[PDB]
């Protein structure tokens, strides 16, 4: 159970998420961020201050997340931005 490949895969994906959230929160305008890795898709929900067009910001986060977690396919990354 707790030390099995399934449970260790979750812990490791959780550790990556927490680094990706810690880093998304370093971006100008991004106040808070939440990253979920579905196993392979990635989901990001960040509260952004619209200092740039939405399309541009989504593109910036998507490129950053790919460069920081190269295991996910670009098209399988999802960014939803809040106020």
UniProtKB/Swiss-Prot annotation:
Required for invasion of epithelial cells. Could be involved in protein secretion. Belongs to the YscJ lipoprotein family. The gene is prgK. It is found in: Cell outer membrane. This is Lipoprotein PrgK.
